[PDB]
């Protein structure tokens, strides 16, 4: 049971490494789907072996959305 699903995506603008029990691992360029823009700071997304793991929004940029439309 889970309410609230989004298809947002973000790309890592810099290499990062999870140094805690609650963190996501990715390199510059990577992409994370299902981004839940939280009101606080850390967001929720999935990445490879990792799933719905907190990650620094300052190390990623939103890529999902209309570019030309």
Curated annotation (Swiss-Prot):
Phosphorylated on tyrosine residues by BTK and SYK; upon ligand-induced activation of a variety of growth factor receptors and immune system receptors. Phosphorylation leads to increased phospholipase activity. Phosphorylated on tyrosine residues by CSF1R. Residues 8-63 form the SH3 domain. It is found in: Membrane raft. Part of a complex composed of EEIG1, TNFRSF11A/RANK, PLCG2, GAB2, TEC and BTK; complex formation increases in the presence of TNFSF11/RANKL. Interacts (via SH2 domain) with CSF1R (tyrosine phosphorylated). Interacts constitutively with THEMIS2. The production of the second messenger molecules diacylglycerol (DAG) and inositol 1,4,5-trisphosphate (IP3) is mediated by activated phosphatidylinositol-specific phospholipase C enzymes. It is a crucial enzyme in transmembrane signaling. This is 1-phosphatidylinositol 4,5-bisphosphate phosphodiesterase gamma-2. The gene is Plcg2.
